[PDB]
Amino acid sequence: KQYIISEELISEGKWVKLEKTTYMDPTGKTRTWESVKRTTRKEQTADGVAVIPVLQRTLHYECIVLVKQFRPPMGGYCIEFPAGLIDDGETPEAAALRELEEETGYKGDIAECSPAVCMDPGLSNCTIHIVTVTINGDDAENARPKPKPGDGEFVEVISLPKNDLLQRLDALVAEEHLTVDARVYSYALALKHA
Amino acid sequence: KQYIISEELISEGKWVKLEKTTYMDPTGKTRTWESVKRTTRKQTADGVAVIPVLQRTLHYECIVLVKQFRPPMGGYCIEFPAGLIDDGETPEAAALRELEEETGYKGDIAECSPAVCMDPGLSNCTIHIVTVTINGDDAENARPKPKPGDGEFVEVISLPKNDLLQRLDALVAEEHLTVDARVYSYALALKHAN
Numbered sequence A: 001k002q003y004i005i006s007e008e009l010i011s012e013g014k015w016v017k018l019e020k021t022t023y024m025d026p027t028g029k030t031r032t033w034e035s036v037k038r039t040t041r042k043e044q045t046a047d048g049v050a051v052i053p054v055l056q057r058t059l060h061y062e063c064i065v066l067v068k069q070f071r072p073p074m075g076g077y078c079i080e081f082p083a084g085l086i087d088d089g090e091t092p093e094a095a096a097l098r099e100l101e102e103e104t105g106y107k108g109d110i111a112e113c114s115p116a117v118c119m120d121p122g123l124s125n126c127t128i129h130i131v132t133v134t135i136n137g138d139d140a141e142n143a144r145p146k147p148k149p150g151d152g153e154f155v156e157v158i159s160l161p162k163n164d165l166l167q168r169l170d171a172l173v174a175e176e177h178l179t180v181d182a183r184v185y186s187y188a189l190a191l192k193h194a
Numbered sequence B: 001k002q003y004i005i006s007e008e009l010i011s012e013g014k015w016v017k018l019e020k021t022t023y024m025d026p027t028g029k030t031r032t033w034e035s036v037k038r039t040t041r042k043q044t045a046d047g048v049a050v051i052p053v054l055q056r057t058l059h060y061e062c063i064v065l066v067k068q069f070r071p072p073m074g075g076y077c078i079e080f081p082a083g084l085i086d087d088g089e090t091p092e093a094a095a096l097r098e099l100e101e102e103t104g105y106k107g108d109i110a111e112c113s114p115a116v117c118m119d120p121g122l123s124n125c126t127i128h129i130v131t132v133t134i135n136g137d138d139a140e141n142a143r144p145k146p147k148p149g150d151g152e153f154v155e156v157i158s159l160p161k162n163d164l165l166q167r168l169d170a171l172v173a174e175e176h177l178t179v180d181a182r183v184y185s186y187a188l189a190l191k192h193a194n
Ligand SMILES: COC(=O)Nc1sc(C)nc1-c1ccccc1
Pocket: A031, A032, A033, A034, A035, A122, A123, B015, B016, B084
């Protein structure tokens, strides 16, 4: 029933634009929306990837490897899955493995890769692939992992046990000012509810 | 170490604005970020998203989701029921209200997250994730009455919690729909648990 009629640029930055979207509603009535998009999406099946990195080590409980960074839109520190935008021509799997190494130091192994999923579909067209990766923490490659940040990347690594993830996130939030990402919280909640 | 210095308005619509954020990187170098914010917040968070667990005896437990045309995406998305929190409303009450409006179900609060970020590399948007149970055997939930506010057009899709990820993958494969990243993350963790 519903479809897009037109998309009018309102303002274009280097990285993000705002558009006036005209669409058809299911009553047959024309309506508008204010929509955000990135300027950086070319032929990628999505803007970015987020990595669900399952650190596995003999005689350890499995950990979920998370990162903490300052996020200027938020004005504060956020705890997230490692993540970044997909380079032109790069596959979602390649991007996930690369970002994971860049941000954490760890060299992972692909487990699964989602379809393109929406970040905040009432606001933006932004999409990611959510890529599950296992990290063999018994491999010597992963023994003393060093982040390789890019220019202006400043990332702290936080590994938490999968079997207590929600409580451990709650304990970090109780301890300083900082926001947990909604995807991370959602995953931690499902681990409780299962 | 890192903090906002100033924000420069680039463009303000009625519902969304784009800013150029100036911040201090941890080395002491000043840097810029393009940031999106809503104009609507006053509030613990912009929105609520509801994880609704539909419980009927002698049936599988289901997670209740909604399907809606999303103008920023140009298409239909599958999402947790959700909406913005009214000035003076609690996140709990917003959750029960949105769940009823979008689904017709009357639910009980189970738990409520802190404010969690939606896409912190891009925006300041935050939500409370509110877990709610629905007693599907109660007379009030027998014939659930969905009350859409103006211009909302919402289909209800209930899926079994025990096979959620496979069911969502099937919908995507058959229906050309976008699943929400928080829905997908939750579905992933249901599979990854234990
Ligand atoms: C003509 O109306 C719009 O453009 N509305 C927009 S634009 C946006 C980015 N959000 C809305 C919105 C927010 C809360 C509840 C309903 C809608």
